[PDB]
């Protein structure tokens, strides 16, 4: 369905001056919530003006290296329950909490005390994963990393190097591949992107080491090969990527599905990748857009129809931040 050749138009800059923006949760009314990894804040961005409101600081966050306040996601029933979920690196682990958001409260006081729904994910200075999202099945999904310990990914008993699927209350999701376990898929290095297509099939981005970054089509119980395999050609028993990229051209974090393609934000690549899909295969060659125009790109989210939100990441410790960084852009895509 999507054309082989795509396009990306930057309609406008929506907001500026964000610090280490990471998680992005589009609100029903058109506004955005954005987390800061290193400041541990969640901030509301007014879509029209770019005006920023600090909701508050998430308690218990311990930023260091790639860890800190990471993915955020609205409850599937957010419109009525006003619950915001957050994945973050604590003193001891990575974990997921939920907080009651009340926009009628003073700035800084808008987040209720966190309810911890899931704990115990391995942490390190690197490879903490951190992207969370609710699937069309109303279950909570989380990408993790192996924390720099390559031995965790293949170990079904370790929460490191996995995609997890749980109830919103933090219990293993009914119908998961392994009895009593929140593990959905394994053999992952570091996963910071999740998105579903129109047929409710999950895709995930992944950072490779020095050779191949990945876009994977995720099936429950499948083994994506890390650390014995990296990129395509993993061998029998391993599930290969839909597409792979050199680490200098990608190093991908967030992904979004829109207009029949996966859109993938590249950090080191400083570019937005388009992967048009036919079923769970690439329909045509992936194409990159915006290379070096806005620096590092971390997060991309659907804004409805042919529109995307895109978040830069030049303030995350590995960029050269320019005046006004980091920013959110509005894109119109094909």
Ligand X SMILES: O[C@@H]1[C@@H](O)[C@@H](O)CO[C@H]1O
Ligand Y SMILES: O=C(O)c1cc(C(=O)O)c2c(n1)C(=O)C(=O)c1cc(C(=O)O)[nH]c1-2
Annotated binding-site residue numbers for Ca(2+) = 208-209, 214, 224
* Binding region for pyrroloquinoline quinone: 189-190, 192, 207, 268, 296, 298, 318
Site for ligand X contains 269 (CB under 6 A): yes
**Strand (E) or helix (H) holding 79:** helix 78-81
What's the CA gap between 125 and 148, in Å, rounded?
A: 8
**Residue in the structure block whose two tokens are 């080191």:** 268
* Binding region for alpha-L-arabinopyanose: 199, 201, 248, 271, 279, 291
Of 122 and 225, which has the nearer Cβ to Ca ion? 225
- Tell me if the bond preceding 246 is cis, omega within 30° of 0: no
Site for Ca ion contains 192 (CB under 5 A): no
CB of 300 to ligand Y, least distance (A): 15
Among positions 266-285, residues that touch Ca ion (CB under 5 A) are none
Site for ligand X contains 278 (CB under 6 A): yes
Intra-chain end-to-end CA distance of the chain, in Å: 11
Three-state DSSP class for residue 78: helix
CB of 137 to ligand X, least distance (A): 18
**Strand (E) or helix (H) holding 151:** none
Binding track over 199-218 against ligand Y, x by CB under 6 A:
--------x--x--------
Of 99 and 267, which has the nearer Cβ to ligand X? 267
311 in Cβ contact with 25 (< 8 Å): no
CB of 241 to Ca ion, least distance (A): 6
User: Distance between alpha carbon 132 and the CA centroid of its chain, in Å?
Assistant: 6
123 in Cβ contact with 159 (< 8 Å): no
**Choosing among ligand X, ligand Y, Ca ion, none, which partner's interface includes residue 199 (Cβ < 5 to 8 Å by kind)?**
ligand X
Site for ligand X contains 8 (CB under 6 A): no
Among positions 199-228, residues that touch ligand X (CB under 6 A) are 199
CB of 167 to ligand Y, least distance (A): 27
Three-state DSSP class for residue 239: coil
Q: What does the angle CA 120 – CA 122 – CA 127 come to, to the nearest 5 degrees? A: 145
Region label for 192, one of left (φ > 0), alpha (ψ between -120 and 50) or beta (otherwise): alpha
Site for ligand X contains 249 (CB under 6 A): yes
Q: What does the angle CA 216 – CA 248 – CA 267 come to, to the nearest 5 degrees? A: 70
Site for ligand X contains 279 (CB under 6 A): yes
Site for ligand X contains 320 (CB under 6 A): no
What's the CA gap between 40 and 259, in Å, rounded?
A: 33
Among positions 118-177, residues that touch ligand X (CB under 6 A) are none
List residues near Ca ion by CB under 5 A.
Answer: 207, 224-225, 247
List residues near ligand Y by CB under 6 A.
Answer: 66, 127, 190, 207, 210, 247, 251, 267-268, 316, 318
């Amino acid at each position: 369905a999507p054309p082989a050749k795509g396009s990306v138009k930057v309609l406008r800059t929506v907001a500026t001056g964000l610090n280490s923006p990471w998680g992005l949760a589009p609100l029903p009314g058109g506004d955005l919530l954005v987390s800061s990894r290193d400041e541990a804040t969640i901030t509301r961005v007014d879509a029209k003006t770019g005006r920023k409101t600090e909701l508050g600081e998430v308690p218990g966050v311990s930023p260091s290296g790639e860890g800190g306040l990471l993915g955020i996601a609205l409850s599937p029933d957010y419109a009525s329950d006003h619950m915001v979920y957050a994945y973050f690196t604590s003193a001891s682990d990575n974990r997921i909490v939920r907080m009651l958001y009340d926009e009628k409260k003073p700035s800084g006081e808008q987040l209720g005390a966190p309810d911890t729904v899931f704990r115990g994910i391995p942490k390190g200075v690197i490879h903490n994963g951190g992207r969370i999202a609710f699937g069309p099945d109303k279950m909570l999904y989380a990408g993790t990393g192996e924390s720099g310990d390559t031995g965790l990914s293949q170990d079904r008993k370790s929460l490191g190097g996995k995609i997890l699927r749980m109830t919103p209350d933090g219990e293993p999701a009914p119908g998961n591949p392994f009895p009593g376990s929140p593990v959905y898929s394994y053999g992952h290095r570091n996963v910071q992107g999740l998105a579903w297509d129109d047929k409710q099939r999950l895709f995930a981005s992944e950072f490779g080491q020095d050779t191949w970054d990945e876009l994977n089509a995720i099936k429950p119980g499948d083994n994506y090969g890390w650390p014995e395999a990296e990129g395509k050609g993993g061998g029998s028993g391993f599930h290969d990527p839909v597409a792979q990229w050199s680490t200098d051209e990608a190093s991908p974090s967030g992904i979004a599905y829109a207009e029949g393609s996966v859109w993938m934000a590249g950090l080191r690549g400083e570019r937005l990748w388009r992967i048009p899909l036919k079923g769970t295969a690439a329909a045509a060659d992936p194409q990159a857009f915006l290379e070096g125009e806005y620096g590092r790109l971390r997060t991309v989210a659907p804004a409805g129809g042919d529109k995307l939100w895109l978040v830069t990441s030049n303030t995350d410790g590995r960029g050269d931040a320019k005046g006004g960084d980091d920013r959110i852009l509005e894109l119109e895509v094909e």
